[PDB]
């Protein structure tokens, strides 16, 4: 059974009063440095520092020049040469902005997606490799050191509708993506082709790889849109509108993830994490760094947490986190690197701080 417990220590509301769709703690900050997180919503990116006694200290605010931009996602990285932190943000305009989080100014931008960007993810080993997933049915891999588009994952056997989410595995060898077409697709980036394309992007009109075929595809996990996917080791966690996060794997029970053939037609369900009132799309789940906790907010302000070290997903459920004043949809949550703080962000521009007891 789960033993994790949390106390709500603070909340605030951003004055724009627009929904907050993303929240990310900076996991690159070194041990001892202040815990910082970014929120995104409206045409804004806001940074906060966590201090003792629940204090949430406003650091800086970035307001996009375009008043009609609606940011949907953000992700942290660092400059591999100077160790300086960096933040990537994107949304409805389909433009990626690289922001200097110390000065809160935009450094540069990437255009190319034909529609909105639903998620940004940085590679876990190479801080220059940025993955964007879009309403244009494709994923794109960028090298932000050389400003090149490494690869476009889409086409003949790519997604047939808007891509909602994607995740690199722990070592950054492969990506699982999911979207409106109900499918979950695997894209290996440790192939000889992709490793060479990444190397060529460092040597650099650069020619992008056009990856038309995924290494695995399934529409047999969910019966509707798949709006969130994360790797859990070699297994996958994904959700649709069934009020459940499904833990599954490509192939049969004993099939090795690295021996799965691209035409593999089987999938194996290992378990389900059940919850309530979260059957509308655009609701993300998150995990802590060590992947010992899983968190998901619902449409009425409840925050569910599960202990991933408890095998049975029913016994894994922690006490649901609720506050009588937190009644709006929790779009995304983020744990600090050490798992001591869990922040939730809402449709009513509110931010909620929960400290682990």
């Amino acid at each position: 059974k789960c033993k994790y417990s949390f106390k709500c220590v603070n909340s605030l509301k951003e004055d724009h009063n627009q929904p907050l769709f993303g929240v990310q703690f900076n996991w690159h900050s070194k041990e001892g440095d202040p815990l910082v997180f970014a929120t995104v919503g409206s045409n804004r990116v806001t940074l906060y520092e966590c201090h003792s006694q629940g204090e949430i200290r406003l650091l800086q605010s970035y307001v996009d020049a375009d008043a009609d931009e609606n940011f949907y996602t953000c992700a942290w990285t660092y400059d591999s040469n100077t160790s300086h932190p960096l933040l990537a943000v994107a949304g409805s305009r389909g433009i990626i902005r690289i922001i200097n989080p110390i000065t809160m100014q935009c450094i540069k931008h990437y255009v190319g997606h034909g529609n909105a960007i639903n998620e940004l993810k940085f590679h876990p080993r190479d801080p220059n490799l940025l993955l964007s997933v879009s309403k244009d049915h494709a994923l794109r891999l960028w090298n932000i050191q050389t400003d090149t588009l490494v690869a476009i994952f889409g086409g003949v056997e790519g997604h047939r509708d808007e891509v909602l989410s994607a995740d690199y595995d722990l070592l950054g060898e492969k990506i699982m993506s999911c979207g409106m077409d109900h499918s979950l697709k695997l894209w290996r980036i440790n192939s000889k082709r992709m490793m060479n394309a990444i190397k060529e992007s460092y040597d650099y009109p650069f020619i992008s790889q056009k990856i038309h075929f995924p290494d695995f595809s399934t529409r047999d996990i969910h019966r509707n849109y798949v709006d969130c996917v994360r790797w859990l080791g070699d297994l996958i966690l994904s959700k649709s509108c069934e009020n459940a996060i499904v833990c599954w794997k490509p192939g049969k029970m004993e099939d090795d993830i690295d021996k799965i053939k691209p035409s593999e037609s089987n999938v194996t369900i290992l378990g389900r994490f059940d919850y309530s009132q979260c059957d509308i799309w655009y609701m993300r789940f998150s995990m802590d760094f060590w992947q010992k906790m899983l968190a998901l907010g619902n449409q009425v302000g409840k925050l569910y947490v599960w202990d991933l070290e408890v095998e049975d997903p029913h016994k894994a459920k922690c006490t649901t986190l609720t506050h009588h004043k937190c009644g709006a949809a929790i779009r995304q949550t983020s744990f600090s690197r050490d798992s001591s703080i869990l922040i939730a962000v809402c449709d009513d521009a509110s931010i909620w701080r929960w400290d682990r007891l």
Partner: peptide, 29 residues
């Protein structure tokens, strides 16, 4: 088990990332 084997892969792989992070000194925002 499938669970214990998967947890061990997560433990080993997150430990590799944690050691890479420990070796870094990213400037505070």
């Amino acid at each position: 088990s499938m669970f214990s084997s998967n947890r061990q892969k997560i433990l080993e792989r997150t430990e590799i990332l944690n050691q890479e992070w420990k070796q870094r000194r990213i400037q505070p925002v």
